[PDB]
Design a protein around this ligand. Structure first.
Ligand SMILES: Nc1ncnc2c1ncn2[C@@H]1O[C@H](COP(=O)(O)OP(=O)(O)OP(=O)(O)O)[C@@H](O)[C@H]1O
Ligand SMILES: Nc1ncnc2c1ncn2[C@@H]1O[C@H](COP(=O)(O)OP(=O)(O)OP(=O)(O)O)[C@@H](O)[C@H]1O
Ligand SMILES: [Mg+2]
Ligand SMILES: [Mg+2]
Ligand SMILES: [Zn+2]
Lengths: 298, 326, 48, 326, 298, 48
């Protein structure tokens, strides 16, 4: 078995224009390659064919071949490296925003990155492209959770997306800016990426000061500078919460919580998770329904 | 009367579901694609969908373009989408990945029939809501006789099982209340909603002006009697079947040089079974289709072959189509 | 009002000593286990 | 080497199960009957059974004799029985009628696969016991690709479900003992017996010297690639498939007067896909079968057509068989 | 629609020799007949075709057409009459003892007789032929329960079968005759057909006295005559049990039960059922497992 | 032995008066509801 004429037929079909017969022939050749335990040839063949079909504006064949490539990745035990990640990054780049199963292929690549790497949620370099591609496809809530665990460029794109989302809203009602800034603070405080949280806060507050015209006062002490607003107390609460989480002390957290009682009530889940993560506060365990019935009745 | 063409079905403005079934390779996929293409050509104001309920799908091979679990428009046709029901196995995040908002049962036999019924439920729900993509008609490229029969009989089984479960729940009401905790989930309400949805599905599936079955077959003993058994089973389910597509006919008498011993003895057998079919189903739309000089694949080839569903195939005059189709 | 004085006092007390965790701390993504509770969806909608 | 005939399978003294599958009317029933007839002719000391697992059975039509849920000898053949698995519904006394010694689940989709597996279990139990009728080999006339794939994948699903149920039972041992009454039924023992039986079935179904799969197909795009997908799925299940039967070949070049324009363009397409098949499966027993001048029905006709499984069909010399077969 | 050519083709196929094509054509014609709500034509057509296929020594086609005829019987609401029963009796007569699904067709005919008649178990005239046909097929235990609810000829055939079964056993061990006679007494006492029980007892005891040579004494009083054996006390116990069940008095039953303690223990189920049926003895109710657990534990 | 005397006495007492149910009583099969417990299978095998 050499697959000489089969590969020649695949090339002739892909050049002539009949792309589905070429896709089926490519799947046949890849089946023979994987069967013969030759994973390198299959990997390059499938990747090149998927790229060629995605360049031809054909979502179905290219996406099916990406799924085949991910199956070969899983079966061949391919680790997360620069070349292996770039192989998927090229396919993401050639993918279409209007792909009906864009989320499926994105999830497949992310799952492969999870399984074959030390990261518990995926390779940050892969996440940087995944989030942008999902944003192009109007998956903003799904694309925010990918910029969260990305690189520095992912943080920049997350800040840009949040700023554009805020600018697209005509009204303000002194609640929009707080609701946008809370996501930026909390998402980057959950993973304890406080450097990224501080930089994103600086960028967002500078953009807010530029586009809008509120009353700001730079309270700077010891090296730490916090902007102060009169009407927009939520921004001050979020900045002070970031500072308190930075210093990791219980007394400051208690003072902030019992001062800003209304906002602590509004964000109860976020503050209790932050206390559990940072201040070693033992949050109550999950209230399982069966256990609750057994304890309360049995 | 009963003209030998599907013109009444093609230009019908009331049909919502159109099942195409038969016996194992008589042309279910080709004829379903042909019916869908003819309908979408004759009704440019309505969007048509073509689902492949065969667990080994062949819509992509017939159309020369890959289709998936989700509706995808056919290239060159602006009012015809094609979908091939994937056996679930939807990709899910391995870890939490909290976006701001088992598998063994997928391997159980008969899962594809349940998935097809779930797709039907989703489509009727969408039509009731009128949101997202709206498909005014859905044509099914069904599995062979036994499995499409099981698919069509599934609504009755589901309704009976739902009735039994509701009866058991009503009997055990006090007992389940005393046994279960403080759950506020309305089991009876959801059960009744599911029963109403299944009853609406059954009402649409037994309405002669809303659904129909087209039985494709070839004129041979096994295929003819398999079609007879399938039609009997459909009539048992009370589903309107009044069209038959006799496929792969040689027409070796009124052609140019079809004088090859085998391509003539086969036509003698086919004509005998055609006479039997015409004797049996005198009130059916018996559409006679030819055997072309090659496989019927591609949108242009499928359209050229489908042009004989609207108008009856005349082998004396329309004899060059089967040779311009290789 | 009094909120300015409270903010100033809180900042002075917090920045009296260098915090235990550095200003530019970045926990590696390899060691992150939980992402926390999901944030609530916004009442608006991206268009772009 | 790989000769283009099933002689290795026909004269094999070790094979116990032989599945024949393919794509929807390529000749699964005809080729399964042919394989069974050739095996029973070449091995007169062994009794062979031919089960039809297709829910719309066609063994009776092919053999010209009615077969039922129970094994019935083929007339004129003293070592070949044929059985068509009826979908249960066994007749039971309406009232007590105490001789001295539900139905809804029968309508659930996928019931026929479960019944076929139960028949396989009964046959392996009988072979272990060696009582009653003993069938040394069983040939399956399976359903089309998807449903025969579900049938063959059923043992793995059943084994996984049995393992999960046993794990749950072991976990709840004290709890079920404290909850249930004084029942002395050994749930663990019966579960282990069922697991052992299913494991023996799986071991026999993944043994290259005990079971095999014969993939019948016609040389066309849809059929060829359906066969490719089916072979890939079988290899995934680790089931020995090494024979392919390319069926309904015109052989319009090396024949007498096969100059019919169509019977020649169709042969050009068939030869192209034959070259593709020979390129793909170089290590398979690719048996090329002709298209006869009529349907292959009846024991004599099936035997005459099956004679080409033992020896490769030579269209130059064996050209009068397809015309003596109408 | 006239089905002229279809019927002509069915006749030509059945005359030529191709019986399966004729069977399929007949099924087609019967489908068209039943669809057109013409049940008489379908009934005669199916019955005649099934008879023709059974005469041709073809079990499969004839049996399938018998099942079709029973389906038409159920769907057309055909009552149990002389003609309707004779229609099935002819098919039973032409049936083969070696039919693989003889029990299935027998059960179908019996179920139809149950559903469309006042009898709770079937028409006795049908049972007379059903039992004989089942006996021909070596279903003796199943053929005994049909002679039980048959006609007088059914009782005669039941006695003959029991006598032949006893004669076929080489040994006696003074337990064979008792075990054979107990069935004859109890089966005809359960349905309270005491006249048949007495006649069968007379025939069996006369045959026993003829073929064997035991010590018998005719104790005859008031008109009732009972044979007495010395060694074979079981026959005396069975005769006295029949007499006691005839007189329907509790005192005689108690005397017989506490005299023949061993045989009462051996046949405990039979005596307690006889007491419940005849002497208005309230037998204990069924010990349901769930109810037993609920009462004993809950 | 004494069994002869017991049988004679039992027969005389039973046949002192005409039994309530006639000698040739035949309950119609239409009114029969229960066939009773199944009889035990014999340790032989009819083979003719
Ligand atoms: N009228 C025709 N003339 C020539 N070729 C035909 C004709 N109808 C169908 N074919 C071809 O015959 C082959 C089998 O037909 P098809 O794929 O439609 O079968 P099917 O009914 O979908 O089968 P299955 O039951 O396996 O799903 C295909 O290659 C198809 O292109
Ligand atoms: N080589 C052949 N030459 C001529 N006719 C053939 C040949 N093989 C099969 N046939 C005929 O073609 C028809 C379809 O074949 P067959 O009944 O074997 O299909 P199948 O694979 O069992 O289909 P299904 O998937 O519906 O069960 C039958 O009438 C059969 O007699
Ligand atoms: Mg198909
Ligand atoms: Mg078949
Ligand atoms: Zn020809």
């Amino acid at each position: 078995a050499k697959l000489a004429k089969t590969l020649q037929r695949f090339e002739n079909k892909i050049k002539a224009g009949d792309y589905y017969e070429a896709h089926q022939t490519l799947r046949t050749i890849a089946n023979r390659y994987v069967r013969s335990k030759s994973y390198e040839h299959a990997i390059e063949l499938i990747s090149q064919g998927a790229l060629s079909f995605l360049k031809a504006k054909q979502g179905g064949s290219g996406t099916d071949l990406i799924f085949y490539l991910l199956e070969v990745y899983d079966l061949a035990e391919v680790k997360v490296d620069d070349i292996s990640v770039a192989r998927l990054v090229r396919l993401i780049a050639e993918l279409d925003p209007s792909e009906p199963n864009l989320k499926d292929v994105i999830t497949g690549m992310n799952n492969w990155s999870i399984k074959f790497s030390e990261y518990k949620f995926g390779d940050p370099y892969l996440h940087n492209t995944i989030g942008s591609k999902l944003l192009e496809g109007d998956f903003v809530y799904e694309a925010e959770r990918y910029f969260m665990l990305g690189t520095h460029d992912s943080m920049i794109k997350y800040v840009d997306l949040l700023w554009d989302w805020l600018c697209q809203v005509d009204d303000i009602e002194d609640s929009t800016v707080a609701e946008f800034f809370s996501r930026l603070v909390f998402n980057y405080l959950f993973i304890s990426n406080i450097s990224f949280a501080h930089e994103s806060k600086d960028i967002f507050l500078e953009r807010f000061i530029e586009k809008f015209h509120p009353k700001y006062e730079k309270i700077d002490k010891n090296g730490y500078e916090i902007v102060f607003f009169e009407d927009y107390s939520d921004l001050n609460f979020l900045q002070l919460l970031l500072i308190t989480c930075q210093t990791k002390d219980k007394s400051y957290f208690l003072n902030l919580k019992n001062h800003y009682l209304d906002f602590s009530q509004a964000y109860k889940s976020e503050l209790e998770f932050l206390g559990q993560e940072y201040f070693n506060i033992v949050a109550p365990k999950q209230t399982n329904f069966l256990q609750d019935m057994m304890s309360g009745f049995l | 009367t009963v003209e030998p063409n599907l013109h009444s079905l093609i230009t019908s403005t009331t049909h919502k579901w159109i099942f195409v079934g038969g016996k194992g390779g008589v042309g279910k996929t080709t004829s379903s694609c042909s019916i869908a293409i003819q309908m979408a050509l004759s009704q440019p104001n309505k969007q048509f969908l073509l689902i492949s309920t065969n667990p080994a799908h062949n819509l992509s091979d017939a159309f020369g373009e890959k289709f998936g679990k989700d509706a995808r428009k056919v290239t060159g046709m602006n009012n015809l989408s094609c979908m091939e029901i994937d056996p679930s196995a939807a990709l899910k995040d391995m870890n939490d990945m909290a976006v701001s908002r088992a598998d063994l049962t997928g391997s159980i036999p008969g899962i594809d029939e349940a998935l097809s019924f779930m797709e039907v439920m989703k489509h009727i729900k969408r039509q009731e809501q009128g949101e997202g993509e709206t498909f005014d008609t859905v044509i099914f490229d069904t599995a062979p006789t036994g499995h499409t029969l099981r698919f069509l009989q599934l609504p009755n089984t589901l309704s009976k099982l739902l009735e039994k479960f509701g009866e058991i729940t009503n009997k055990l009401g006090p007992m389940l209340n005393s046994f279960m905790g403080a759950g506020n989930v309305d089991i009876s309400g959801k059960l009744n909603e599911l029963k109403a949805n299944v009853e609406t599905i059954r009402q649409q599936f037994t309405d002669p002006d809303l659904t129909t079955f087209v039985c494709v077959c070839i004129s041979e003993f096994l295929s003819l009697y398999e079609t007879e058994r399938l039609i009997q089973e459909l009539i048992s389910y009370d589903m309107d079947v009044n069209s038959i597509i006799v496929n792969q006919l040689l027409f070796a008498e009124n052609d140019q040089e079809h004088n090859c011993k085998r391509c003539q003895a086969r036509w003698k057998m086919q004509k005998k079974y055609l006479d039997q079919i015409d004797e049996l189903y005198e009130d059916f739309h018996v559409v006679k289709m030819p055997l072309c000089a090659g496989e019927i694949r591609g949108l242009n080839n499928l359209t050229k072959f489908s042009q004989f569903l609207n108008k009856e195939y005349n082998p004396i005059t329309d004899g060059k189509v089967i040779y311009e189709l290789e | 009002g009094p909120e300015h004085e409270f903010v100033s006092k809180f900042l002075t007390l917090a920045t009296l000593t260098e915090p235990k965790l550095p200003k530019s701390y970045t926990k590696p993504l390899k060691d992150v286990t939980n992402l926390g509770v999901p944030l609530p969806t916004l009442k608006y909608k991206y268009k772009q």
